[PDB]
Design a protein around this ligand. Sequence first.
Ligand SMILES: [K+]
Ligand SMILES: [K+]
Ligand SMILES: [K+]
Ligand SMILES: [K+]
Ligand SMILES: [K+]
Ligand SMILES: [Mg+2]
Ligand SMILES: [Mg+2]
Ligand SMILES: [Mg+2]
Ligand SMILES: [Mg+2]
Ligand SMILES: [Mg+2]
Ligand SMILES: [Mg+2]
Ligand SMILES: [Mg+2]
Ligand SMILES: [Mg+2]
Ligand SMILES: [Mg+2]
Ligand SMILES: [Mg+2]
Ligand SMILES: [Mg+2]
Ligand SMILES: [Mg+2]
Ligand SMILES: [Mg+2]
Ligand SMILES: [Mg+2]
Ligand SMILES: [Mg+2]
Ligand SMILES: [Mg+2]
Ligand SMILES: [Mg+2]
Lengths: 103, 88, 134, 124, 88
Amino acid sequence: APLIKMRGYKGLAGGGRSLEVPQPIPARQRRSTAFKWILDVVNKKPSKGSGRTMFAHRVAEEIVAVVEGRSSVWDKRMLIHKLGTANRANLNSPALQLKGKRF
Amino acid sequence: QQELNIRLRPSTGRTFYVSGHQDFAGALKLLHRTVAANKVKKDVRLQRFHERPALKRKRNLRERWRARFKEGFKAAVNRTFELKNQGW
Amino acid sequence: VQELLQSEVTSNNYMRMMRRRWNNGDVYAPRDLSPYEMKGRNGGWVEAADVVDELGFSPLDNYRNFSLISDYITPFGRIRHSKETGLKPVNQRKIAKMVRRAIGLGIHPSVHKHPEILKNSNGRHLLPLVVPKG
Amino acid sequence: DEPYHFHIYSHKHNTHITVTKPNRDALISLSCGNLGFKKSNRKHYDSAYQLGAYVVDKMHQMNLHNKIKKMEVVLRGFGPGREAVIKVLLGNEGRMLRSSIVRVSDATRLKFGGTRSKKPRRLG
Amino acid sequence: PNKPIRLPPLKQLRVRQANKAEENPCIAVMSSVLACWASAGYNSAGCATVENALRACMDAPKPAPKPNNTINYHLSRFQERLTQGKSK
RNA sequence: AUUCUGUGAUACCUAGGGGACGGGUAAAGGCGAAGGCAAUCUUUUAUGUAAAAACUGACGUCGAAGGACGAAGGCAAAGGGAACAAAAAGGAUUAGAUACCCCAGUAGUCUUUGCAGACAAUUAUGAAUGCCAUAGGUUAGAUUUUUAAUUUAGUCUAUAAA
Ligand SMILES: [K+]
Ligand SMILES: [K+]
Ligand SMILES: [K+]
Ligand SMILES: [K+]
Ligand SMILES: [K+]
Ligand SMILES: [Mg+2]
Ligand SMILES: [Mg+2]
Ligand SMILES: [Mg+2]
Ligand SMILES: [Mg+2]
Ligand SMILES: [Mg+2]
Ligand SMILES: [Mg+2]
Ligand SMILES: [Mg+2]
Ligand SMILES: [Mg+2]
Ligand SMILES: [Mg+2]
Ligand SMILES: [Mg+2]
Ligand SMILES: [Mg+2]
Ligand SMILES: [Mg+2]
Ligand SMILES: [Mg+2]
Ligand SMILES: [Mg+2]
Ligand SMILES: [Mg+2]
Ligand SMILES: [Mg+2]
Ligand SMILES: [Mg+2]
C-alpha cells in the first residue's frame, strides 16, 4: 500500500500544466488502493482451469506473489513514490501561495 | 596577515564562522537572518530590470504607506486589549 | 558524578528563561514573577535617547574614526536605519553623511567593516586569506 | 592556511557546484546538466538535490573527506539549489564533510547603481 | 523614530483571520519521509521508522477546533475612539 | 528555437584596461521660479526659515510685450561607447502577428558647443493680499519649571461653520 497520493492543482505549473503535490492518505485509502492494484493485475491474467475456484485461486496466487516481492504491484508502488520525492518541494511553491495575492 | 593578506571582498562581510557554541547548522541560521535583515534577496529582484525614477518613487509611496498603515493597525489592536484588560 | 553535570544543564536552562536583570533598589510585586512579565513582550532593544546629543560631538568632524563608521553600518556595509540608531532625523543625516564621506574618501570599506576591526573581532584565525597563487 | 571552498551558485534555471583548492583552483566544477538534465529539467529542486549528492559522492571517490580538514561553504544566488544542496551537506550525505566546515559565506553579487538592466517585461 | 500613526476613518476595523489557521500537523512528517527516500532510497531500512510515524498520523483523530476569537467584536467597539472616525 | 562552447565555454581565480551608473541611509523628508535636484572632497552662487535687537521709511503686489530659463525625444559638430536600446534583421507564438516573449542589435542615452521650445511642463487648481473654528501626525528652529509644554514658518490627514 502506498503512503502518499498525488493531487494536482489546475494551471499553476506553467503553460497550462498542473502543479502536482503529494499528500498522505489514511489507512482505508491505503488498503483500498493496494487491493485494487492486485485485482487489476488479476483480471488481466489468462484463464487457467475450470470450476468455482478460478477467480479465487487466481487472486490468492497474486497475494503470494506480493509477499514474495515478485509481483507487479511493487512497481506501481515505487512509481508513485518517485513522484512524491520528485515533487516534495512543490509543498511551498510560489504558485500555491500566490493565488490572488498579486493584484 | 603579516604573511598572507586578508581577502577583502563583499563576501568577507557576509561571513559567519563555526565555533564551540555555534555549529554549521547554527551558522546557517545566523547567515539567513542577516541576509534577510539586509534584504539581499529583494535587491537581486529589483536589480533584475530597470525601474525609471518616477516608477520607483511611486512604488515607494505605496509600500511606505502600507507599512505605516500596518504599524498603526498593530498599535490599535494592542491598544484595544490594554483597554479591555482595564475592563472598559 | 555525571548526575551532577546534567543538573548544571537544567539550571542554566531556567536561567535563560528569566529574561530580566534584577538590580539593587528595583521594586517588584508578585506579578513581576509571572510568565507575562518574564516573557518580555518587547521585541525591540530600543535606545534611550539620541546619543549624538548626549555625547555632544559633530559626526563630520569625526569621519576619520574607523570604529565609529563600523558602528553605524551593518556587517554588509549598509548604513543603519533610524530604528536601530534611535537618532533624530537631523542627527541621522549627520551620521549617514559621516559614513558616506569616509567611504567616499576611500579610507573605509563599503561592503564590510574596516579590516583592522575584523582582525580583532571573533574569528581572527578564520578570516578569508589570499593565497599568492604563483 | 586557507580552507577549501564549496561554492554553490544557484539561480532560477540552473545550479552550479564548484569545489576548489585553498588557492581557489577548481577540483570539481559540475552543474545540473552534467547529470543528464536537459533544457528545463535543470531548474527543479529535485535535480539540484541530486547534483549535490553527486558532487559529495565524487568527493569521496577522490578521497577528499580525509584530505580536507577545513572547508568553506559559499552561497551565491537564491535559486532552488540554495536550499537543496544545503540539505545534502546538512543531511546524511555530508556526514563526513559536515565536521570540517569552518565558515559559511554569501557571495551574491549586487551592484551599487551599476549598468542599466533590461527593461521590464510585459507578460500579462 | 516616529510613533504609530492614527488610522484614518475605515469602513470597519477588523482582522481578516481572527484565529490562527494552523497547518496540518502531519504535512511536516511526510516531508521527513520524502526526505529519507531521496537520501536513503525507497526500499531501504533506515526509513522504516519515519514511515511508521507517518502511518501513525492518519490513525490518530483530528484535534477539535478552538473557540472563535472575539477580537473583532472588541475592535468594532473602540474603532471611532481609536481612529479618526468611521467611513459611511 | 535562433544563439554561445572543444579556436576550451559556463563555473572558480590572478593581473591589467575601459565606460557609464549611484546600495544602504530614506521619511506623510528636504531644496529651487518652474523644468527639475539623491555616492564623495575642495572651490563657487541667489533666495528662503527661527529669535532677538538695530536700520531704511511704503521703497509694495500683479504684469501684455521683449528678454531669460525650460523634461524627454530630436537636429548639427567633435568625443566617448561598458551597459541599455527606437531602427533594421533573425527565432518563436498565432487562424494570421506589424506586435506582446526570446537570441542579437544601430541611432540615441553620457561629454563639450549651438539649434530647437512642443509635455498629464499637474495640485487636471495663475500669482498675491486681508480674513474664518478644531483635532491628530510630521519637517526646520525658538522659548521654558528643556519631563513636556508654548510658539514661528512649512507639509499632510480627518472634521466644524460654510
Ligand atoms: K557544467
Ligand atoms: K515635476
Ligand atoms: K539587448
Ligand atoms: K518578428
Ligand atoms: K501642523
Ligand atoms: Mg454456482
Ligand atoms: Mg529586450
Ligand atoms: Mg497574452
Ligand atoms: Mg581560458
Ligand atoms: Mg569609472
Ligand atoms: Mg540611495
Ligand atoms: Mg523653500
Ligand atoms: Mg513680482
Ligand atoms: Mg511674457
Ligand atoms: Mg534636451
Ligand atoms: Mg542630445
Ligand atoms: Mg553625431
Ligand atoms: Mg541629460
Ligand atoms: Mg534657447
Ligand atoms: Mg514633467
Ligand atoms: Mg502669472
Ligand atoms: Mg514635502
